[model samples]
Target chain A: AAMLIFVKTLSGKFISLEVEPSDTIENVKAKIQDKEGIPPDQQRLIFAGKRLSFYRKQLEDGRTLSDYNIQKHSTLQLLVISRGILY
Target chain B: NEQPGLCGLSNLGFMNSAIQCLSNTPPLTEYFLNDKYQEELNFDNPLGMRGEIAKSYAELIKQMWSGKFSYVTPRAFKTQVGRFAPQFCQELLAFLLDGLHEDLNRIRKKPYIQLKDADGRPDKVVAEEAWENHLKRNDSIIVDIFHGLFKSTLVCPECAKISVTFDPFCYLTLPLPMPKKPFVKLKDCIELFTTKEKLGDPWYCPNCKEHQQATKKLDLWSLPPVLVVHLKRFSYSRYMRDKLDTLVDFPINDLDMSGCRYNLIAVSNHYGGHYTAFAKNKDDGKWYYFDDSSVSTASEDQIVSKAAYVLFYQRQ
Candidate 1:
């Protein structure tokens, strides 16, 4: 079943999307990247104060939304990370 | 002269926080601040190979925000950075991260050596109150908050032998993949960075005991609190520089870095030989554009663009 997840950004913005428990961390990140513009490499998701992975590389980046216990109406936060190599 | 300084220390907040992390440590506080150092604010470029750089950048930045320069040489910081020559903001980061040569020399002369632990194995790399490693309650937050390690794997095609190496980095310098559009998606950039690539250079394998072709791959083992990303836009080869003007697509809200989330807070922008900062105030979440003395509200459109050289993101 596709569950709707609510994403709150540090900038005071929120993202609501239908997420699958089977979806990989990178998969969710890719979707968030389009809607919110946060890069996958720079995005980090937290649930109950524990950090999740991009599908746990050992499993081939295959950690599902269920791995982090992301339930329906889960309120997750997307943290955006930067580019001034201003040399 | 005063007008020129705004161009140099526009990202004053980043440095202040870093110095603030120096905390109760006398070594750093005395070097960067204190009576004599604050009065002279003298720092010479120890490397002669650097050639003719206008004014000393450290002195300039020190005075610019020090407020001590109210009636003095207000332009001290800008002239040197005008000589900054549209390079990477990482240079300024390095300049600020490191101790002054004089400070280094003096610290070395005194020699505060760490004694071997009772069991002796160079003491554990992890927690300790006396040492500066752990982040929580530790005086030095720079390393604790920003440092991470990358595990790199190299496998030789001929011998099918694999060699893994762990490399440490202060900032994640990710490469942008070849663009299909002048406006490339940020997802594509991350994919290119994490993907395994065919190595052109031959690898000398111990199993085969000879130089042979190998494939290389990288994976993230750690992530820091204050995450930094550097876009490699410049390609220099034999007296020529190639700069990519590709409009890199970026997100302003939440950044997905594998598993953790980082909030976009600061950016260093470069245009026509000068660097400016697009900074966000944490208290109000208001964005500001600072190009020296000239300050203005930053529109959302200006914040996300191809002109960015460096980015500062705080861990959520």
Candidate 2:
């Protein structure tokens, strides 16, 4: 079953994304990319003062959103990052 | 006739009592007496006694087991103790065991181990790594016989930051509660030891970026082969001191410690200024009391009393 969670962007933009427990954090980030024109690489998701990483090797074996105990109606903060344009 | 007793040198009752009890500990005896420690001694470790204390202790154990002398004077071993303590019997035992552990530590070059907080990691993963880190620097028969892990957790009330760490313990100093009745059970003290309490001072929370009020809890994650429990009978503040004479009714045999069955092996007792010990002899399966140089056979009923200070138990 799918549930809706609010992802608040840097400019107070609340974007509703439909997600499931089985979906990887990368999968949720891709959904946000589809709704708002931000790419997954540019988006940094923060929940409960912890950065949500989409991928890891060996230990967690690519954790899903449910692996992080993310439930329905959880609000996540999205910080958009710009590539090293100055360099 | 093969039993152990130590002759005194002017109020050496506390040291004698503790030594007598530790002498009866099977694994400790076997390790030191069988020349097993000679191979494992790390002379280079700066924290160690450079095999001096362990060697002295080995000689004493050998002398006791030789049955050549009815009662032996621990003159060399006492000198090796090196002007430290006879005030607290438990502290003396701690110093001795710690000295033995460092002297007999198998690790040659101690590794640099930095333990991090278990931040959102699985406890099993974190606990194993913590134990491994400890072993990287400290590996010895003393650790194998006497050490166990304590799971300490702290949670920041303000930002809800949780930090978990596993700390090692040589012995458990459990606090005693003044009971309405004359007696308190052993389990009650263990429960009080593990109970959650608020940390008085503020803790710097990583999540909050500021000091916050935190709550802490301690639980026994692992148990050692030999468990030494010291009752917190004597306590003092700057202004005052007190000793609780409350009778702690503990199991003389088959004490259940968190699903593990442990049989009583020794009891270190204190009355006024003097110390004595009651140790269970493995050879004949009987109890004996050692007071300074005097050794007399004792019964089970005599082991548990108000003066019971430190109790030793072996895993069954």
Candidate 3:
């Protein structure tokens, strides 16, 4: 079954994506990067104040969109992932 | 098993003495060491010089870089080990740091696992928050060290209701991958675990509020500093538990878990009534086989080739 969810940009506009639950998070981000012009690694995907976490390594890229329980027509945020030396 | 020393295992060798002396006698403290003090402490001596060698080893560990015990006499410590002689060392490293707890892992608690509502409100709660809530409820230190998050997704093919749920687990237990070529690499077990399955009839669906056929799959969402993996080695049924003898291929240096890297630290091997261990020393990168009272330099192949009961890996 396909699920359609909204990914919000920092500029306060939302883009609706018709994606499948089997789609990997990396694939979803890549799709968003194509339409939104946001870098894949620079994306901070947050839904309900919860963002995928991994300070050093890539987070949720290998996971599926459904693995995080993203419901249909739900809202999410795509902020610029902060990059700096994390010692 | 093979030899007298082999039967005693790493239990009576350098691990026993190193952990003993390293615990108290180091850091230029006035405290003395306690391996040979077996007689002085008057341990139960239920069998030989020590009946409870592991108990003593664990007891001595309480006095490591920081102390967990409050000054027990030698006799009390010895008797503790004596009561432990019938046991075998599982993971040598975990036993060494038996007391060190990461105080920061303590978090706020949650009373219940929130149920999803049709309105899509409860669905926003992520696994990490729920896991923290569970940790606070349990109030355990071990959870911080070995915990990871597992995500399971269900997509009903009929109405297209997709529900994803994440759960927390202390161990990543893998079922033996029988289809992958001979001596299936540890990586194969992981692939098998994430493979999708059809939610057969009688599978309840929260979104549908009815049992529906769905595609369900699980993947690792979070990993821990110490990744302990357990294999279902025993073939169990209503009758009895039979040992599984197939060898599992594992990596000694770099274990590729999804994209995460972990170095194999130790492995526990079970041979019927006897058990042995192989551990990588933290000081030197060398690997050693600890067979009761005997310690020998081991090749990377030695630890990787053994049929392990439980494998321990430290994050790289």
Candidate 4:
């Protein structure tokens, strides 16, 4: 089954992406970075209240973004900025 | 400020009676008059009898100065109440209350107040005794109670519980979540039930349900795109210059720069910028910025207002 991914931009824009079930959040971020012109280091990924990190150790359920099966439809907030000062 | 007539009773002693009053049936009148009446109000007095009171007041002031107090006036009350009472009371109260206020003020006023990236965390409290002495020396201590009030409202998003009152900084270490998307609207209740399977549980309000639906239906083409602006380095003087430059270019008058340093990072989002901003340390790899996006632009005057809002919503 294809996974439906909802992407929210900084401008409050929401987009849906459909990919193969095997696609990881990292792959999704790559797609977003390509579309948004944001570097991978400058972006932050959040789902279900947890910040998604590229560092494999932070993956939930011991699953990499690639291995995790996104539900048919899942909501995600992608912040394209480096981690530093919170306003 | 005129030196008010010193009453011989220690403020710590009076506070002891106050705590006892809260826990016991009897008021503190007896404890104040009988056991502690003749206890000469001296700076050398041990805080044992009134230690709890001193500690309680200390915690309250700490919360207030550290931006954890709920009530705005209580911080002022905590600051003033010590001097208004008797000498003994003043000394004890000054020792604890002033200590907390000064420490909190110092923490907030410092070049930076160490904050956690995650929600449901407490602001770090450092330099307890030094701040106390600082407060004692100054007469017109301005209490910015907003910090305390704001810090109090933070709760854990995952557990839906308030952070511990005293050690609020602990919550800073916990990972914070993001706000749920497709915020529910009020008018779509019936529709939600009809499409319950695709939408899943019908427990959320219509607004939330609709928001969820909208979010689910979103495609890259539909959502608004944002330019998340992140600051690489933040220095007090440099930050001030940036504001001055902006102010010169923009047409605003009488900008208050007094507390601007505390609220500097938030300004990035003010002029068609992102919601949150953060300061990065050169030596450490840890990222300090959490909510440096536009989502935190609700209140104008607050320092860390956007960050606080993001944390609050993330927890909820």
- Per-candidate iRMSD: 21.0, 18.2, 16.1, 20.9
For model 1, report DockQ: 0.01
Each model's lDDT comes to 0.51, 0.75, 0.53, 0.28
Model 4 agreement with the true structure over B205-276: per-residue lDDT tens digits: 222322321111100111001111121122255445332111111111222211221112112222232233
- Residue pairs clashing, model 3: B8-B292, B9-B291, B9-B292, B10-B291, B10-B292, B52-B81, B52-B82, B55-B81, B56-B81
Which lDDT value does model 2 have at A10?
65
* Tens digit of per-residue lDDT, candidate 3, span B1-316: 1311111222322234323222321211121233332232322211122324434443444343223332223454434433433232433333322211111122222233332322333433666565665465333234545667777677787788767766655556677754323477778777877888786522345466555668877788778766767666665467475565667887777887757898877676667646556766544656667554455677877665535766777777
Worst 10-residue lDDT window for candidate 1 chain B reads B106-115
Best by TM-score: 2
Query: How does candidate 4 fare on TM-score?
Result: 0.22
Give TM-scores of the second chain, every candidate: 0.62, 0.92, 0.60, 0.15
Q: List candidate 3 stretches off by more than 4 Å.
A: A1-87, B1-60, B63-125, B138-140, B155-161, B179-181, B198-203, B207-216, B239-243
Q: Supply fnat for every model shown.
A: 0.00, 0.00, 0.00, 0.00
Top candidate, metric lDDT? 2
**C-alpha root-mean-square deviation, each candidate:** 20.8, 15.9, 19.3, 23.5
lDDT of 4: 0.28
Candidate 1 — what's its lDDT? 0.51
What value does the lDDT take at residue A71 in candidate 3?
Answer: 56
Q: List candidate 4 stretches off by more than 4 Å.
A: A49-69, A82-87, B1-316
Model 3 chain B worst lDDT window (10 residues): B23-32
Alpha-carbon shift of residue B192 in model 4 (angstroms)? 17
**Model 4 chain B weakest 10-residue run by lDDT:** B218-227
Scored against the true structure, residue B120 in model 4 reaches a CA lDDT of 34
- Per-prediction DockQ: 0.01, 0.01, 0.01, 0.02
